[PDB]
Amino acid sequence: LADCKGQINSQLRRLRELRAKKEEARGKKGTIYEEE
Amino acid sequence: GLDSSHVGVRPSPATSQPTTSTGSADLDSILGHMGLPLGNSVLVEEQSTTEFHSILGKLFAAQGIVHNRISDSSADKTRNGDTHVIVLSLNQMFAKELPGIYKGSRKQMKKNLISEEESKVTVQNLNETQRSTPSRYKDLKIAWKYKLADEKRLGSPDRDDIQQNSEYKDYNHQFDITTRLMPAPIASELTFIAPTQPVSTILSQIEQTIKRNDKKLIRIVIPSLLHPAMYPPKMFESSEIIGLMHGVRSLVKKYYERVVLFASISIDIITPPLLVLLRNMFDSVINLEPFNQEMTEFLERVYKSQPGKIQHGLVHILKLPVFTDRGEMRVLKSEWAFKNGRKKFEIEQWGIP
Amino acid sequence: ASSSHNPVILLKRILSLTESSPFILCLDSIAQTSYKLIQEFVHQSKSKGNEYPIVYISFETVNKPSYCTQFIDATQMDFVHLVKQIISYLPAATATQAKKHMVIIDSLNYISTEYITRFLSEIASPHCTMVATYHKDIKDENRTVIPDWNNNYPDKLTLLQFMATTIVDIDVVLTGTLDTEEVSELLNEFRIPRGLNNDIFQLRLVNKRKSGRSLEYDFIVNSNTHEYELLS
């Protein structure tokens, strides 16, 4: 349970939204450099 | 001259004479002496617009700074490692950009199997405890028996003791990308020379710079020489450069115990006449042939699924220290592949993939 | 990586100055002149809206360009003046946070090599974008330099290919009954046959990146609808 809580917290804290979406088919958009 | 027991008074498997290490294990091994005997000069070369040459031309100075920044008590004595570093270039901005001594974990030694996030800790955005970025074998130390195409005993068993035998191996320090050898030095370690000023001034200035030290090592490194970005047309005459190089040769051959020379340029835009007229002046020539877009296809085909096995070019050797002047042919072209990724500038024996 | 996943997108980003480029070089010849690419700049770099001063420094051109906003005649200025009466219109190397303008040089063949690098030193700023064309069919003057055995230095072409961060080559697409051999011949003895100097042309693109190898591709460019097609 402690591991699950830590995993959830770490997973939900590292959401940086990937503000380099090509700016600002195979991938169908070209957005996998460390995504998916 | 230089008193004994300096960092690089190592013997040589041929002459048993002083041979300071270039710092890179494969650069010390391929050269053929665990470095170069004092009084000789080396010419690393890059035939294209790539700029791998800008890497080594830093550590060769920085490693010297290392021996000038550890002046504590040795096993019993206080080791001498002072090496006045000189650069014949106006770019003072280069000074504050050198890689530093490498510490911390270098490879992975997981007790259990290597696996993904759920196995040990967390999401890998916070990395796992011991080591990340799988790269099994990372070069660490120096050896006196690491020469390529030489006898056996190619390994130094990560020895952690200081002795007279530690002059040979197990002292020299590794560096990496993010490491920084801070703080920046002072005039005690780095001396910059403006190249655009006339050679008559440059020669006397470098004379006075070397002579003011009496029993200390002098290292000379030129990052880039004779390039349009920082040089005037007047210096491209066939007289000035050759005469300056002749003076440099005269002085380095005079002080065969306390000075060396290491310069490297790009020759994609150099007239062959001047190139081979100056290539005969010093006593070591090494070329580099980086890979191009037609072959990176097969590079990733054969090195597929590898995060640290990707190479970047091939190596040529055309001249080496004195023991090639005795009538032996030793030119070798495009047989060893050099890699400078994010770890461990390495040389591996293979031709085209 | 996750940027410029199509060559056409890269070309359009270059053309519209979305990504800054300190230096770009374009090569042409007599078989196809290079004033259509300025039209490409004008049309493409206006979708993003660059009405910023498009200075047209001129050495030989007789007419005043409509598509540009400035006009400078340099048949009476020396090097130091030529640098000095351009920093005013351009965003000179002051005001470390400022805009960027457009620079069009009509010709590169009339300038002595001895100052070439300096002409890119006193002006190079993160505010300016140098655009100039190079005619390859004019062999420069070399009596003054006296290329003897003791007076040597590299030639203009290599310096131009070295200090450039992006290179584009222009060629005329063969359409009718003329092939490269006889075309080059007839040009050598100057008969200039029909089938030359059209708006539909072809380009070769070489784009250089920091710490790496450049990329080389080819393009087919029309000067009528401003549309592109990458080499198959």
Coordinates of C-alpha atoms in Angstrom, one line a residue:
Chain A
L1 CA 0.0 0.0 0.0
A2 CA 2.9 2.4 0.8
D3 CA 4.4 1.4 -2.6
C4 CA 1.1 2.0 -4.4
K5 CA 0.7 5.5 -2.8
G6 CA 4.3 6.4 -3.7
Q7 CA 3.8 5.2 -7.2
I8 CA 0.6 7.2 -7.6
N9 CA 2.2 10.3 -6.2
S10 CA 5.3 10.0 -8.4
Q11 CA 3.3 9.3 -11.5
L12 CA 1.0 12.2 -10.9
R13 CA 3.8 14.6 -10.0
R14 CA 5.8 14.1 -13.2
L15 CA 3.1 15.4 -15.6
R16 CA 5.0 18.1 -17.5
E17 CA 2.5 18.1 -20.4
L18 CA 5.2 17.9 -23.1
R19 CA 5.3 21.6 -24.1
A20 CA 7.4 20.7 -27.3
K21 CA 4.6 19.2 -29.4
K22 CA 6.6 19.6 -32.7
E23 CA 6.8 23.3 -31.8
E24 CA 6.1 25.8 -29.0
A25 CA 1.6 7.9 -40.7
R26 CA 4.0 6.3 -38.2
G27 CA 3.3 8.3 -35.1
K28 CA 0.2 9.8 -36.8
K29 CA 1.4 13.2 -35.5
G30 CA 5.2 12.9 -35.0
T31 CA 5.2 13.3 -31.2
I32 CA 7.3 10.4 -29.8
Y33 CA 10.7 11.3 -28.6
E34 CA 10.1 10.2 -25.0
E35 CA 6.3 10.1 -25.1
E36 CA 3.9 7.1 -25.1
Chain B
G1 CA 65.8 20.7 -16.1
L2 CA 62.6 19.1 -14.8
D3 CA 63.2 17.2 -11.5
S4 CA 62.3 13.6 -11.3
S5 CA 59.1 12.1 -9.9
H6 CA 56.7 14.2 -12.0
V7 CA 53.3 12.8 -13.0
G8 CA 54.4 11.8 -16.5
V9 CA 58.1 10.7 -16.1
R10 CA 56.7 7.2 -16.9
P11 CA 59.2 5.0 -18.9
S12 CA 58.4 3.8 -22.4
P13 CA 58.4 0.2 -23.7
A14 CA 61.1 1.3 -26.2
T15 CA 63.2 4.0 -24.7
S16 CA 62.2 4.1 -21.0
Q17 CA 62.0 7.9 -21.3
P18 CA 59.5 10.5 -20.0
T19 CA 56.1 10.1 -21.7
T20 CA 53.2 12.2 -20.5
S21 CA 49.7 10.8 -21.1
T22 CA 47.4 12.4 -23.6
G23 CA 44.5 11.6 -21.1
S24 CA 42.4 9.4 -23.4
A25 CA 43.3 5.7 -23.0
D26 CA 42.9 5.0 -26.7
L27 CA 44.9 8.1 -27.6
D28 CA 47.7 7.0 -25.4
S29 CA 47.4 3.4 -26.7
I30 CA 47.2 4.1 -30.5
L31 CA 50.0 6.7 -30.3
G32 CA 52.3 3.9 -29.1
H33 CA 54.0 5.2 -25.9
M34 CA 51.1 5.6 -23.4
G35 CA 51.3 9.2 -24.6
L36 CA 54.1 11.0 -26.4
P37 CA 57.8 11.3 -25.5
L38 CA 58.7 14.9 -24.6
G39 CA 60.0 17.1 -27.4
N40 CA 57.6 15.7 -30.1
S41 CA 54.3 17.2 -31.5
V42 CA 51.1 15.6 -32.7
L43 CA 48.6 16.7 -35.4
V44 CA 45.1 15.4 -34.9
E45 CA 43.0 16.3 -37.9
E46 CA 39.4 16.6 -39.0
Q47 CA 38.8 16.6 -42.7
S48 CA 35.2 17.7 -42.7
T49 CA 33.1 20.5 -41.0
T50 CA 32.5 18.3 -37.9
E51 CA 34.2 19.6 -34.8
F52 CA 35.1 16.6 -32.6
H53 CA 38.6 18.0 -32.5
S54 CA 37.3 20.7 -30.1
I55 CA 36.8 18.0 -27.4
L56 CA 40.3 16.5 -27.0
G57 CA 42.0 19.9 -27.3
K58 CA 40.4 20.8 -24.0
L59 CA 41.0 17.7 -21.8
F60 CA 44.7 17.7 -22.7
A61 CA 44.9 21.1 -21.0
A62 CA 42.4 20.2 -18.2
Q63 CA 44.2 17.0 -17.2
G64 CA 47.4 19.2 -16.8
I65 CA 45.3 21.5 -14.6
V66 CA 44.5 18.4 -12.6
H67 CA 48.2 17.8 -11.8
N68 CA 48.5 21.5 -11.0
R69 CA 45.4 21.3 -8.7
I70 CA 46.6 18.4 -6.5
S71 CA 49.6 19.7 -4.7
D72 CA 48.9 18.0 -1.3
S73 CA 51.1 15.5 0.4
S74 CA 51.5 12.3 -1.6
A75 CA 52.3 8.9 -0.2
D76 CA 55.2 10.6 1.6
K77 CA 56.3 13.5 -0.6
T78 CA 54.5 16.4 -2.3
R79 CA 54.1 15.4 -6.0
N80 CA 55.1 17.8 -8.7
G81 CA 52.5 18.1 -11.5
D82 CA 52.6 21.8 -12.3
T83 CA 52.2 22.3 -16.1
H84 CA 52.0 25.8 -17.5
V85 CA 49.3 25.6 -20.2
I86 CA 49.6 28.0 -23.1
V87 CA 47.0 28.7 -25.9
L88 CA 48.0 30.5 -29.1
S89 CA 44.6 32.0 -29.6
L90 CA 42.6 35.1 -28.7
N91 CA 39.5 33.2 -27.5
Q92 CA 39.6 33.7 -23.7
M93 CA 36.0 32.4 -23.5
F94 CA 37.4 28.9 -24.1
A95 CA 39.0 29.0 -20.6
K96 CA 35.8 28.5 -18.5
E97 CA 34.6 25.4 -20.5
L98 CA 36.6 22.5 -19.5
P99 CA 35.4 19.0 -18.4
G100 CA 36.2 18.1 -14.8
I101 CA 37.3 15.0 -12.9
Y102 CA 34.8 12.2 -13.1
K103 CA 33.3 10.5 -10.0
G104 CA 30.1 8.7 -9.2
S105 CA 28.7 5.4 -10.5
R106 CA 29.7 4.7 -14.1
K107 CA 28.1 1.4 -14.9
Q108 CA 25.3 -0.8 -13.6
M109 CA 25.8 -3.7 -11.1
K110 CA 22.2 -4.6 -10.2
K111 CA 21.9 -7.4 -7.7
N112 CA 18.7 -8.6 -9.3
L113 CA 17.7 -8.5 -13.0
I114 CA 17.7 -5.2 -14.9
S115 CA 14.0 -4.3 -15.4
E116 CA 11.5 -1.4 -15.7
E117 CA 9.8 0.8 -13.2
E118 CA 7.7 -1.7 -11.4
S119 CA 10.6 -3.9 -10.4
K120 CA 12.5 -1.7 -7.9
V121 CA 11.5 1.9 -7.2
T122 CA 9.5 4.2 -9.4
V123 CA 8.5 5.8 -12.7
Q124 CA 12.1 6.3 -14.0
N125 CA 11.5 10.1 -14.2
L126 CA 13.0 9.7 -10.7
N127 CA 15.8 7.4 -11.7
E128 CA 16.6 4.1 -9.9
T129 CA 19.0 4.0 -7.1
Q130 CA 22.2 2.6 -8.6
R131 CA 22.6 3.3 -12.3
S132 CA 20.5 4.3 -15.3
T133 CA 21.1 4.7 -19.1
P134 CA 22.3 1.1 -19.8
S135 CA 25.9 1.2 -20.8
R136 CA 27.7 -2.0 -19.6
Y137 CA 31.4 -1.2 -20.0
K138 CA 32.8 2.3 -19.3
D139 CA 36.5 3.1 -19.5
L140 CA 37.9 4.2 -16.2
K141 CA 41.7 4.3 -15.7
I142 CA 45.1 4.4 -17.3
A143 CA 47.7 1.6 -17.8
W144 CA 51.2 1.2 -19.1
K145 CA 50.2 -1.9 -21.0
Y146 CA 47.1 -0.7 -22.9
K147 CA 48.7 -0.2 -26.4
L148 CA 46.6 -1.6 -29.2
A149 CA 48.4 -4.4 -31.1
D150 CA 50.8 -5.0 -28.1
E151 CA 51.4 -7.7 -25.5
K152 CA 48.9 -9.0 -23.1
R153 CA 47.9 -7.7 -19.6
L154 CA 45.6 -5.0 -21.1
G155 CA 43.8 -4.4 -17.8
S156 CA 44.5 -2.5 -14.6
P157 CA 42.3 -4.1 -11.9
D158 CA 40.9 -0.8 -10.5
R159 CA 43.7 -0.6 -8.0
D160 CA 43.1 1.7 -5.0
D161 CA 46.6 2.0 -3.6
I162 CA 49.3 4.6 -4.1
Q163 CA 52.9 3.5 -4.6
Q164 CA 55.9 3.8 -7.0
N165 CA 54.1 1.4 -9.3
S166 CA 51.2 3.8 -9.2
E167 CA 53.3 6.1 -11.4
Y168 CA 52.6 3.7 -14.2
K169 CA 48.8 3.2 -13.8
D170 CA 45.8 3.7 -11.5
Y171 CA 46.3 7.4 -10.9
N172 CA 45.2 9.2 -14.0
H173 CA 41.7 10.5 -13.8
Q174 CA 38.7 10.1 -16.1
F175 CA 36.4 12.9 -17.3
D176 CA 32.9 13.1 -18.7
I177 CA 30.4 15.5 -20.3
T178 CA 28.7 17.4 -17.5
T179 CA 31.8 17.4 -15.3
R180 CA 33.4 20.8 -14.8
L181 CA 36.9 21.4 -13.6
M182 CA 36.1 24.5 -11.5
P183 CA 37.1 27.1 -10.6
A184 CA 38.7 28.8 -13.6
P185 CA 42.5 29.0 -13.4
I186 CA 44.7 32.1 -13.2
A187 CA 47.8 33.3 -15.0
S188 CA 49.6 30.6 -12.9
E189 CA 48.2 27.9 -15.2
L190 CA 46.8 29.4 -18.4
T191 CA 48.5 31.9 -20.7
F192 CA 46.6 33.2 -23.8
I193 CA 48.4 34.5 -26.9
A194 CA 46.8 36.7 -29.5
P195 CA 47.5 35.1 -33.0
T196 CA 46.6 38.0 -35.2
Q197 CA 49.6 40.1 -34.0
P198 CA 52.8 39.7 -36.0
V199 CA 54.8 36.5 -35.6
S200 CA 57.9 38.6 -34.6
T201 CA 56.0 39.5 -31.4
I202 CA 54.5 36.1 -31.0
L203 CA 57.8 34.3 -31.0
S204 CA 59.4 36.5 -28.4
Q205 CA 56.3 36.5 -26.2
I206 CA 56.1 32.7 -26.2
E207 CA 59.9 32.6 -25.5
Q208 CA 59.4 34.7 -22.4
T209 CA 56.3 32.8 -21.4
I210 CA 58.2 29.4 -21.4
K211 CA 61.5 30.6 -20.0
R212 CA 60.1 32.2 -16.8
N213 CA 59.5 28.7 -15.5
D214 CA 62.8 27.0 -14.8
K215 CA 62.1 23.4 -13.7
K216 CA 58.3 23.0 -14.5
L217 CA 56.5 21.4 -17.4
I218 CA 55.1 23.5 -20.2
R219 CA 52.1 22.4 -22.3
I220 CA 51.1 24.1 -25.5
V221 CA 47.6 23.6 -27.0
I222 CA 46.2 25.4 -30.0
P223 CA 42.4 24.7 -30.4
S224 CA 42.2 26.1 -34.0
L225 CA 44.9 27.5 -36.2
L226 CA 44.8 29.6 -39.4
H227 CA 41.0 29.8 -39.9
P228 CA 39.1 32.6 -41.6
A229 CA 36.9 33.2 -38.6
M230 CA 39.8 34.7 -36.5
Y231 CA 42.8 35.2 -38.9
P232 CA 43.8 37.9 -41.4
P233 CA 44.8 37.2 -45.0
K234 CA 48.2 38.6 -44.4
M235 CA 49.1 35.6 -42.2
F236 CA 48.4 33.1 -45.0
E237 CA 51.7 33.8 -46.7
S238 CA 53.9 30.8 -47.3
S239 CA 56.7 32.4 -45.3
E240 CA 55.3 33.5 -42.0
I241 CA 53.5 30.3 -40.9
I242 CA 56.4 28.0 -42.0
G243 CA 59.0 30.2 -40.2
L244 CA 56.9 30.3 -37.0
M245 CA 56.5 26.5 -37.1
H246 CA 60.2 26.1 -37.6
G247 CA 60.9 28.3 -34.5
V248 CA 58.4 26.2 -32.6
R249 CA 60.2 23.0 -33.7
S250 CA 63.5 24.5 -32.7
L251 CA 62.3 25.4 -29.3
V252 CA 60.5 22.1 -28.6
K253 CA 63.6 20.1 -29.7
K254 CA 65.7 22.3 -27.5
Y255 CA 63.6 21.6 -24.4
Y256 CA 62.9 17.9 -25.0
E257 CA 62.2 17.5 -21.3
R258 CA 59.8 20.3 -20.3
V259 CA 57.7 21.3 -23.4
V260 CA 55.4 19.6 -25.9
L261 CA 53.1 20.7 -28.7
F262 CA 49.6 19.7 -29.7
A263 CA 47.6 21.5 -32.4
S264 CA 44.6 20.5 -34.6
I265 CA 42.7 22.2 -37.4
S266 CA 40.2 21.4 -40.2
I267 CA 41.6 20.8 -43.7
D268 CA 38.5 20.6 -45.9
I269 CA 39.4 24.1 -47.2
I270 CA 43.3 23.8 -47.2
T271 CA 45.4 23.9 -50.3
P272 CA 47.3 20.6 -50.5
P273 CA 50.7 22.3 -51.2
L274 CA 50.8 24.2 -47.9
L275 CA 49.2 21.3 -46.1
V276 CA 51.9 18.8 -47.0
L277 CA 54.6 21.5 -46.7
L278 CA 53.6 22.0 -43.1
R279 CA 52.8 18.3 -42.4
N280 CA 56.5 17.5 -42.6
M281 CA 57.4 20.0 -39.8
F282 CA 56.3 18.1 -36.7
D283 CA 56.5 14.4 -35.9
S284 CA 53.0 13.0 -35.5
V285 CA 50.0 13.1 -37.9
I286 CA 46.6 11.6 -37.2
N287 CA 43.4 12.1 -39.3
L288 CA 39.7 11.6 -38.6
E289 CA 36.9 10.6 -41.0
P290 CA 33.5 11.2 -39.6
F291 CA 30.6 9.2 -41.0
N292 CA 28.1 10.7 -43.4
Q293 CA 24.4 10.4 -44.1
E294 CA 24.7 7.6 -46.7
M295 CA 26.2 5.2 -44.1
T296 CA 24.4 6.1 -40.9
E297 CA 21.7 3.9 -42.4
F298 CA 23.9 0.9 -42.1
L299 CA 25.4 2.2 -38.9
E300 CA 22.0 1.9 -37.2
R301 CA 21.3 -1.3 -39.1
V302 CA 24.3 -3.1 -37.7
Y303 CA 24.4 -1.3 -34.4
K304 CA 20.7 -1.6 -34.0
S305 CA 19.1 -1.6 -30.6
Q306 CA 22.3 -0.2 -29.0
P307 CA 22.3 3.0 -26.8
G308 CA 26.1 3.3 -26.5
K309 CA 27.6 1.2 -29.3
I310 CA 27.0 3.9 -32.0
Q311 CA 30.3 5.1 -33.6
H312 CA 31.0 8.4 -35.3
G313 CA 33.9 7.9 -37.7
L314 CA 37.2 6.2 -38.6
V315 CA 40.8 7.0 -37.7
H316 CA 43.9 7.5 -39.8
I317 CA 47.5 7.6 -38.5
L318 CA 50.2 8.9 -40.8
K319 CA 53.0 9.9 -38.4
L320 CA 54.1 8.9 -34.9
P321 CA 57.0 9.7 -32.5
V322 CA 60.7 9.2 -33.2
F323 CA 60.7 5.4 -33.6
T324 CA 59.2 5.7 -37.1
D325 CA 62.1 7.7 -38.4
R326 CA 64.4 4.6 -38.2
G327 CA 63.0 3.4 -41.6
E328 CA 59.8 1.6 -40.5
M329 CA 56.6 2.2 -42.3
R330 CA 53.6 2.6 -39.9
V331 CA 50.9 4.6 -41.8
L332 CA 47.5 3.1 -41.2
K333 CA 44.3 4.6 -42.6
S334 CA 40.6 4.0 -41.8
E335 CA 40.8 0.8 -39.7
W336 CA 39.8 2.0 -36.1
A337 CA 36.4 3.6 -35.4
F338 CA 36.3 6.4 -32.8
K339 CA 33.2 7.1 -30.8
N340 CA 32.4 10.2 -28.7
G341 CA 28.8 9.8 -27.5
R342 CA 27.9 11.0 -24.1
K343 CA 30.4 8.6 -22.4
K344 CA 33.9 7.2 -22.9
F345 CA 35.6 8.5 -26.1
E346 CA 36.7 5.1 -27.4
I347 CA 38.5 3.4 -30.2
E348 CA 37.2 0.1 -31.5
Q349 CA 38.9 -2.2 -34.1
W350 CA 36.6 -2.6 -37.1
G351 CA 36.2 -1.1 -40.6
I352 CA 32.9 -0.4 -42.2
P353 CA 30.0 -2.0 -40.3
Chain C
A1 CA 13.5 14.6 -33.3
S2 CA 10.0 16.0 -32.6
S3 CA 10.6 19.0 -34.8
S4 CA 10.4 19.5 -38.6
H5 CA 9.2 16.0 -39.4
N6 CA 8.7 16.9 -43.1
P7 CA 11.3 18.6 -45.3
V8 CA 8.7 21.0 -46.7
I9 CA 7.9 22.2 -43.2
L10 CA 11.7 22.8 -42.7
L11 CA 11.9 24.8 -45.9
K12 CA 8.8 26.9 -45.0
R13 CA 10.2 27.6 -41.5
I14 CA 13.5 28.7 -43.1
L15 CA 11.7 30.9 -45.7
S16 CA 9.4 32.6 -43.3
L17 CA 12.2 33.2 -40.7
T18 CA 10.4 31.2 -38.1
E19 CA 13.8 29.8 -37.0
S20 CA 16.6 32.4 -37.0
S21 CA 19.5 31.8 -39.4
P22 CA 22.6 34.0 -39.0
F23 CA 23.7 33.3 -42.6
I24 CA 22.2 31.8 -45.8
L25 CA 23.8 31.5 -49.2
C26 CA 22.2 31.0 -52.6
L27 CA 24.0 29.9 -55.8
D28 CA 22.8 30.6 -59.3
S29 CA 24.2 31.1 -62.8
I30 CA 23.3 32.5 -66.3
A31 CA 21.2 29.4 -67.1
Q32 CA 18.8 30.5 -64.3
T33 CA 19.0 33.9 -62.6
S34 CA 18.1 34.2 -58.9
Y35 CA 15.5 37.0 -58.5
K36 CA 12.6 34.6 -58.1
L37 CA 13.8 33.5 -54.7
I38 CA 13.4 37.0 -53.4
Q39 CA 9.8 36.7 -54.5
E40 CA 9.6 33.5 -52.5
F41 CA 11.0 35.3 -49.4
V42 CA 8.5 38.2 -49.9
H43 CA 5.5 35.9 -50.3
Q44 CA 6.3 33.3 -47.7
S45 CA 7.6 35.6 -45.0
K46 CA 4.4 37.7 -45.2
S47 CA 2.1 35.0 -44.0
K48 CA 3.8 35.3 -40.6
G49 CA 3.7 39.1 -41.3
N50 CA 7.3 40.4 -41.7
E51 CA 6.8 43.9 -43.0
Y52 CA 10.1 44.8 -41.2
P53 CA 12.5 46.9 -43.3
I54 CA 13.5 44.8 -46.3
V55 CA 16.7 46.7 -47.2
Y56 CA 18.0 46.0 -50.7
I57 CA 21.7 46.8 -50.9
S58 CA 22.6 47.0 -54.6
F59 CA 25.9 47.0 -56.5
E60 CA 24.7 46.6 -60.1
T61 CA 20.9 46.7 -60.4
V62 CA 19.5 49.6 -62.3
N63 CA 15.8 49.3 -61.2
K64 CA 14.3 49.9 -57.8
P65 CA 12.6 46.8 -56.3
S66 CA 8.9 47.2 -55.6
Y67 CA 8.7 44.2 -53.2
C68 CA 11.4 45.7 -51.0
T69 CA 10.9 48.8 -48.8
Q70 CA 14.5 50.3 -49.0
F71 CA 17.0 51.0 -51.8
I72 CA 20.7 51.6 -51.4
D73 CA 23.1 52.2 -54.3
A74 CA 26.7 51.2 -53.3
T75 CA 28.5 52.3 -56.5
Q76 CA 30.1 55.2 -54.6
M77 CA 30.7 53.9 -51.0
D78 CA 33.8 52.2 -49.6
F79 CA 33.8 49.2 -47.2
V80 CA 33.7 51.2 -43.9
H81 CA 30.9 53.5 -45.2
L82 CA 29.0 50.5 -46.6
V83 CA 28.9 49.0 -43.2
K84 CA 28.1 52.3 -41.5
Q85 CA 25.1 53.4 -43.6
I86 CA 23.5 50.0 -43.1
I87 CA 23.5 49.7 -39.3
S88 CA 21.0 52.5 -39.1
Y89 CA 18.2 50.9 -41.1
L90 CA 19.0 47.4 -39.7
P91 CA 18.7 46.6 -36.0
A92 CA 22.4 47.1 -35.3
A93 CA 24.1 45.2 -32.5
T94 CA 22.4 47.3 -29.7
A95 CA 19.1 46.9 -27.8
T96 CA 19.8 43.3 -26.9
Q97 CA 16.0 42.6 -27.0
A98 CA 14.7 43.9 -30.3
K99 CA 13.2 42.8 -33.7
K100 CA 14.8 41.5 -36.9
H101 CA 14.9 42.9 -40.5
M102 CA 15.5 41.6 -44.0
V103 CA 18.7 42.1 -46.0
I104 CA 18.9 41.5 -49.8
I105 CA 22.3 41.8 -51.5
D106 CA 22.0 41.9 -55.3
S107 CA 25.4 40.5 -56.1
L108 CA 28.5 39.1 -54.4
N109 CA 30.9 39.0 -57.4
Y110 CA 31.9 42.7 -57.2
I111 CA 33.6 42.5 -53.8
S112 CA 37.3 41.7 -53.2
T113 CA 37.9 38.6 -51.2
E114 CA 40.3 40.4 -48.9
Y115 CA 37.4 41.9 -46.8
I116 CA 34.9 39.1 -47.2
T117 CA 35.1 37.7 -43.6
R118 CA 35.1 41.2 -42.1
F119 CA 31.9 42.1 -44.0
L120 CA 30.4 39.2 -42.0
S121 CA 32.1 40.3 -38.7
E122 CA 31.1 43.9 -38.1
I123 CA 27.5 43.2 -38.9
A124 CA 26.8 39.7 -37.6
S125 CA 24.1 40.1 -34.9
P126 CA 21.1 38.2 -33.7
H127 CA 19.0 41.0 -35.2
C128 CA 20.1 40.7 -38.9
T129 CA 19.6 38.1 -41.6
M130 CA 22.0 38.3 -44.6
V131 CA 20.7 37.1 -47.9
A132 CA 23.0 37.2 -51.0
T133 CA 23.3 35.4 -54.3
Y134 CA 26.5 34.2 -56.0
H135 CA 27.0 34.0 -59.7
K136 CA 29.3 31.1 -60.5
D137 CA 30.0 31.9 -64.2
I138 CA 32.1 35.0 -63.4
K139 CA 35.7 34.3 -62.6
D140 CA 37.0 37.0 -60.3
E141 CA 40.0 39.3 -60.8
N142 CA 43.4 37.9 -59.6
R143 CA 46.1 40.1 -61.0
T144 CA 46.2 42.3 -57.9
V145 CA 46.5 39.3 -55.6
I146 CA 49.5 38.0 -57.7
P147 CA 49.0 34.3 -56.8
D148 CA 52.7 33.5 -56.8
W149 CA 54.4 30.7 -54.8
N150 CA 54.7 32.9 -51.7
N151 CA 51.4 34.9 -51.8
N152 CA 48.7 32.3 -51.2
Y153 CA 45.3 32.1 -49.4
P154 CA 42.1 30.2 -50.1
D155 CA 39.7 31.1 -52.9
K156 CA 36.3 32.8 -52.5
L157 CA 34.1 29.8 -53.1
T158 CA 35.5 27.8 -50.2
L159 CA 35.2 30.7 -47.8
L160 CA 31.6 31.2 -48.9
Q161 CA 30.8 27.5 -48.4
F162 CA 32.5 27.5 -45.0
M163 CA 31.0 30.5 -43.2
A164 CA 27.5 29.6 -44.4
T165 CA 24.9 27.9 -42.2
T166 CA 22.5 27.1 -45.0
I167 CA 23.2 26.6 -48.7
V168 CA 20.7 26.5 -51.5
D169 CA 21.6 25.8 -55.1
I170 CA 19.4 27.0 -58.0
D171 CA 19.0 25.2 -61.4
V172 CA 16.6 25.5 -64.3
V173 CA 14.6 22.4 -65.0
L174 CA 15.1 21.0 -68.5
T175 CA 11.7 20.9 -70.3
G176 CA 12.1 20.6 -74.1
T177 CA 14.9 19.3 -76.4
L178 CA 18.0 20.5 -74.5
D179 CA 20.3 18.4 -72.4
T180 CA 23.1 19.4 -70.1
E181 CA 26.0 18.6 -72.5
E182 CA 24.8 20.7 -75.4
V183 CA 23.4 23.4 -73.1
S184 CA 26.8 23.8 -71.4
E185 CA 28.5 23.8 -74.8
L186 CA 26.3 26.4 -76.4
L187 CA 26.7 28.5 -73.4
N188 CA 30.5 28.1 -73.8
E189 CA 30.3 29.6 -77.3
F190 CA 27.4 31.8 -76.3
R191 CA 24.5 30.9 -78.6
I192 CA 21.9 30.9 -75.8
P193 CA 19.2 28.5 -77.3
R194 CA 15.5 28.5 -76.5
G195 CA 14.6 26.5 -73.4
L196 CA 16.2 28.7 -70.7
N197 CA 15.3 31.0 -67.8
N198 CA 11.8 29.8 -66.8
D199 CA 9.9 30.3 -63.5
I200 CA 9.7 26.6 -62.7
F201 CA 13.0 25.7 -61.3
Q202 CA 14.8 23.2 -59.0
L203 CA 16.7 23.6 -55.8
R204 CA 19.3 21.7 -53.8
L205 CA 19.2 22.3 -50.0
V206 CA 22.0 21.7 -47.5
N207 CA 21.1 22.6 -43.9
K208 CA 23.8 22.6 -41.2
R209 CA 23.1 21.9 -37.6
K210 CA 25.3 22.4 -34.5
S211 CA 27.3 19.4 -33.3
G212 CA 26.4 17.2 -36.3
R213 CA 26.3 16.4 -40.0
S214 CA 24.2 18.6 -42.4
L215 CA 21.3 17.3 -44.4
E216 CA 21.1 17.4 -48.2
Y217 CA 17.9 17.1 -50.2
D218 CA 16.4 18.3 -53.5
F219 CA 13.3 20.3 -54.3
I220 CA 11.1 21.3 -57.3
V221 CA 9.8 24.9 -56.9
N222 CA 7.2 26.7 -58.9
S223 CA 7.2 30.5 -59.1
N224 CA 3.6 30.8 -60.1
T225 CA 1.5 29.4 -57.2
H226 CA 4.3 29.3 -54.6
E227 CA 4.1 25.5 -54.0
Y228 CA 6.9 23.0 -53.5
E229 CA 7.5 19.3 -54.2
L230 CA 10.3 17.3 -52.5
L231 CA 12.6 15.1 -54.6
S232 CA 11.0 11.6 -54.9

